[PDB]
Design a protein around this nucleic acid. Sequence first.
RNA 1: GCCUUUUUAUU
DNA 2: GTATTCGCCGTGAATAAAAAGGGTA
DNA 3: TACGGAAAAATAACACGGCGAATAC
Lengths: 72, 49, 97, 1285, 50
Amino acid sequence: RVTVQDAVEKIGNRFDLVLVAARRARQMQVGGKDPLVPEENDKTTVIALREIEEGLINNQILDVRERQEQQE
Amino acid sequence: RSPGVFFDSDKGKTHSSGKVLYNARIIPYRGSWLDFEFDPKDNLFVRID
Amino acid sequence: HARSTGSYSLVTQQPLGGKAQFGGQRFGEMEVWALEAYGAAYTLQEMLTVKSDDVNGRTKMYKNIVDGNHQMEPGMPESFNVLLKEIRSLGINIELE
Amino acid sequence: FDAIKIALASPDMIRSWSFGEVKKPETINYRTFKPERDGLFCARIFGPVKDYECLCGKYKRLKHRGVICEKCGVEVTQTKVRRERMGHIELASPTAHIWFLKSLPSRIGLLLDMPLRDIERVLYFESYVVIQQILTEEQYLDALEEFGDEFDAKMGAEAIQALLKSMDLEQECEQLREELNETNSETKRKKLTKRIKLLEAFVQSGNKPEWMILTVLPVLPPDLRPLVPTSDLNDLYRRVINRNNRLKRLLDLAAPDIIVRNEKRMLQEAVDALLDNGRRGRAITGSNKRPLKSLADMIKGKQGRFRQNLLGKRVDYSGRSVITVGPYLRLHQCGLPKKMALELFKPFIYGKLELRGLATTIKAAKKMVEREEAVVWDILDEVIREHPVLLNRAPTLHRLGIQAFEPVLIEGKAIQLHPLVCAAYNADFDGDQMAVHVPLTLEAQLEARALMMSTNNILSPANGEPIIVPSQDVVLGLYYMTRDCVNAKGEGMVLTGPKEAERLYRSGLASLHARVKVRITEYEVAKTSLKDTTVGRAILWMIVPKGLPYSIVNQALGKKAISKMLNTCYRILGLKPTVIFADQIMYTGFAYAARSGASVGIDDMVIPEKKHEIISEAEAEVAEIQEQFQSGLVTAGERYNKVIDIWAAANDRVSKAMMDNLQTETVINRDGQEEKQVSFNSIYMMADSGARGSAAQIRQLAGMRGLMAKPDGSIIETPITANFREGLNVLQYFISTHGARKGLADTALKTANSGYLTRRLVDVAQDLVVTEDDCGTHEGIMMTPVIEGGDVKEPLRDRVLGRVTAEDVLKILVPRNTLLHEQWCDLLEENSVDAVKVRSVVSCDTDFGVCAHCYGRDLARGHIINKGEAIGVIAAQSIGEPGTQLTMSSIQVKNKGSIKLSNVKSVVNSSGKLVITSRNTELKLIDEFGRTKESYKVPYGAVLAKGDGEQVAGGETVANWDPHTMPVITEVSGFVRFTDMIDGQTITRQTSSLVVLDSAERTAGGKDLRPALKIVPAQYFLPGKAIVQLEDGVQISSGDTLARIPQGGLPRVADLFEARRPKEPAILAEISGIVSFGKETKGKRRLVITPVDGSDPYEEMIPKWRQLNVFEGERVERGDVISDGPEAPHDILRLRGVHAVTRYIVNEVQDVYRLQGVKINDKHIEVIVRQMLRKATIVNAGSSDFLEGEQVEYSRVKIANRELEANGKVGATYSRDLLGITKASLATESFISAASFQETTRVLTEAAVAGKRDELRGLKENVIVGRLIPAGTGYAYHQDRMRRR
Amino acid sequence: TASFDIEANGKVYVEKGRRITARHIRQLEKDDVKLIEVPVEYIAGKVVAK
RNA sequence: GCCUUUUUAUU
DNA sequence: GTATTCGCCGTGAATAAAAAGGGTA
DNA sequence: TACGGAAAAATAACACGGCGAATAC
Ligand SMILES: [Mg+2]
Ligand SMILES: [Zn+2]
Ligand SMILES: [Zn+2]
């Protein structure tokens, strides 16, 4: 998007933000994973950051979503 | 550099160590360069090539 | 000069220079430090392996971008294997663990 | 892989790499392009030249992978397998390695305890050694008939290999271990401590000494040295195999001794020319006079693999073109061309074509791109709608040289680089052609949007000021709006809001600058007041965000003024309203600059009428000075300083007369009296704003340019009398080029030095990564701003801005672990306290890095520094960035403050003066608030008019001294007696005056006798070349004089960072005690201090031309200089302390940084000296494992000390060594990082003989080996990698 | 500069242990004497060169 | 299909 | 044994274009 | 079809620190 200052206040560290957004982008590319955000015509780079703008995607709650996919 | 006798000097802090240096350069059109350089020990030394 | 894919050099597996040689842009040692200053670890690992070094990777990347998947795989850089044979051509032993 | 181990190549290890043996010197056949049998390019030895095709042409169709034929024996495989397989040669004679021979120190020379000169005489067959002693060829004929049956001698590397086979590793190390424990040597101990370090590292890496001498030599793969339709390496390989084949031809026919010693020498020189060039008897040259590239020439230097092919790898999906302005696009956007981005995103087009189903293949998708139809561009704008694209300048001497953008498709093959980041690139639009790059994968695209985007790159990493500064045009459009004019259109009218001023100006009935009253709504909640605001400043209120105040807008808004306007928006409003605000500044500052019409012309500025009278007065003033020199009133040196005095005063008189003709010149009748207001000249609008012209640049423009410098450094006597408006003269323009072409030759040559300084600064600081959140150490340095100048330039507001304190200072005022924010730093400013103990970089004790809280703030983000950021690379890039910006008496206390003297044992005088007795005195101008602003280091012998502890008024002389003569001051009063002071032998008198003779030119009758002066208790001694005006029998006071003793920028950054000794080093005192005179008949004065509790037999070495600062009658102290001049960086660490050297290097680098005007924070230099203090010399072994004389890293002795503190044995202390940016980058761990810097022929030999298996730590290593960087999000990958291991 | 005084036929020209000015250069030119008295220690510091 | 020197030119 | 000078050796920015030359009879 | 390397070249000859080696005292 325009700026990333709203997504960095939810996680803190900037390099932890790239790790959680890359794993969110891998699920949106190969294994489906339709996002909870309203889908627009932008690419998956902005969708990986728009989910952290309100705080529905974090580095702690993405690992429990990977284990939820492994149980199914 | 023109062929002939060239009197050079490097004052200040370039190879001085607290003393002035005077090197005389005789350079030909072709051949071997002939140099007469000083030292901080105050002894004229000749340098060829 | 713009180059996506083209002919590579024969000494090391790297792109070429000049518009007549399809225009592979040289990064340089000064721009590696400006890339690692921000902390772009995934970008600097791409900039010198997937672009030039990973011969087994840049063909797997070229089959991945045309598939629609932007996934980078870790590989052994052949540009360091160029450097590995240069030290091994001397009387100096060097190996990987 | 996790580690790389380097050792010596075994004869079995070389044959293990090679799959075949080469016997032919010719590379390929001359008739056809097919290799012969056992050749350098043969398919049986290395592999086939075609993909799955044999050399004969029988095995094809890819139906086999590991078949071996029987006709030609060619193992058919892939083409890339030929790049890995190597070959070897079996030499008839052993060959010594040239890298281990010509290195400093020699690896072969230290094993055979011989120097470089005799170890090469036996190798090139001029001498013989036994299997030790060195005997020549004429001593070999007598040795066979006298001691021929007892000992046998050989020559060449065969005798070297037989001697290394004879000696043992454990037997030679035991003889050297007992020699170091009992020796009274210093220089001889240095030669022995590097030899036992060579022996102790062989048994740890299990490397035999005979493996250094090469019996078998390996060759490169043929794809590593490929033939082309003749190379610079394969012709050099023909020099070696021709010598290898001729030695095999000499053994079978029983060649004599004369011809085999000459053939083995040329065989040894062929390997010496193959593995290296430039370190031999003569470097081999090619047929076209160029030096031939060896295996070392293609591994070191700029043309090596480490710089051209491992750090300078060329990049696909990446283009290069010139840059443009592009004002219509946003800050996160730029402009990519249509046919250029189509060629950069060529697989990205193929991915979207197969996704939708237009072309579900790779062959017809190439036809759709090359046809350039209408459906290709609609696919293209979906890919480049939000794709980050790295814009990259080809010189990046700064961090901001690589910024990401979200481009749009435009016409024209040039990139539209944003003007707000144009000052961040430090590169104007002067036709510069620069690169561009894209990230392919999604984990690399998020690195560009979260870290490399231009939106979150507002603040510079160097200083707290933002790097997004409006430079020329947008600030000019802002400056024409924010102005006040009388008698304007629509003067004195009301406005409903700030948005109505856009209606007021676009209709054209009112001017852009008119004194009106607009209603504004200010936030932090909304307040409203009717203040005096012009029409142009009311346009700004719709541009600024809500929470931005008005008090930063009400000024003239120059470039120096709006640098804080962009900084205050980042501070209290946040980054999310900063991008819209900065874009709307660029939208308003560009569109209103078109409506401004600010231009340059001959009618804009005007030559003042006072200029023609000043030049006529200055030309009349030099007429009487020249006539005084003809009569003989002044000398040559006094006249030369007087002409520059009366011209620079005339240059300052014409500077103010030209300034008032641009400030208050043009007036307009405002329906009444003619009032004095600010002139609306466009030259002054570009001068007061500080946009592109300074106060001195317009001085050179409208007025005379002043004094110009000579090429050697002196000043022209007669400067330029005219100016550029009416034109210069021929000689006036010629002496103008004496500083302009000199400054441009300064610019074009210091970029080769600052570019080398950029490589020297990063390569030593690339290992330093932040790794911990909190450690728990309270150690740190004391912070003090610049006080030695007259006016304070950099106060404590910008010094400790964003640095976590170590110890809590007092007025409990501040906590320890709390980071100093912008509010906490202002709380320290209002208290006006100094000596703040902060956490420094050199005070942190962690492994391969420092802590996050021990560093401070990043100054590029609003929060604290993130864990896992390259903390030594962001600072070293902001050190070379001002490298191309800078070039390559009595006291008078002007301000008001109370004086204060520290460590001064002041006594009473005869007149009541505050007389000093110590050498190192520092004045403290303590104010009434509690801080200081002025400081002066007066010499020893300055008479102070007032004592210490009272207030000194401003403009009053407090002290006075003589710099040419150094006096001596006693402590107490009493009678004086000339003890051991006789005349005729060592004292002569010249006429009424006494003088002591110098120690060099004196006779041999008074060399032993030294003068003295005791009180009648303290004894005072005087040195030579002194004048004693005092006679015997006169009562003197304490402060009376007894002996009169008469007498660029970028190199300063280069000499201090390398930790070198200057031409005039300052000697320091080791132990505080009594210093004597010295010893004569030596040629150089020696210093010795024998205190009660000090070290007796310590001696120094001082040259005769240097002088002694401290006297031999007074007590010396640890930290007092002995020689006047610049302090050496090596002696301030070993003697004054560890926290003292990190204050000296920072404050002297920042001293020459203020001369250019750049603002670099002090912590950025502090991370470099931490990489200069990471090498230490341990003073005692004790319970440790390594030797005392060995020099290892500080990170190795710190983890080993914490292991001892948990155990019962005590830890061994260490002494740090200040290895510079060249020294510490080589003699360190991570040999991959050290081989890329320099000395690849040396530091690879230092790592092969010592093991040095690096643990994949460092940034230069991970770049060369090509994996994830441990200073980004790969630090989290490295954090999980330590959890896996 | 010498520590001894140079005399010539009972006339003192150079003072012992004092740097002379440029007045003694022009004064000595009118009364050139080709023989003076010199101590034995001044010549020992020189070289013989023959 | 290249590589290395040299020259010009750019920042 | 202790310096001391010096021979040789590390380094001398970055990036685009053209030219010959790629062993000698 | 052979040797690739030597002595002459009627060679090209820089500057600012640095490390180890061969002397004076
Ligand atoms: Mg430019
Ligand atoms: Zn075959
Ligand atoms: Zn710490």
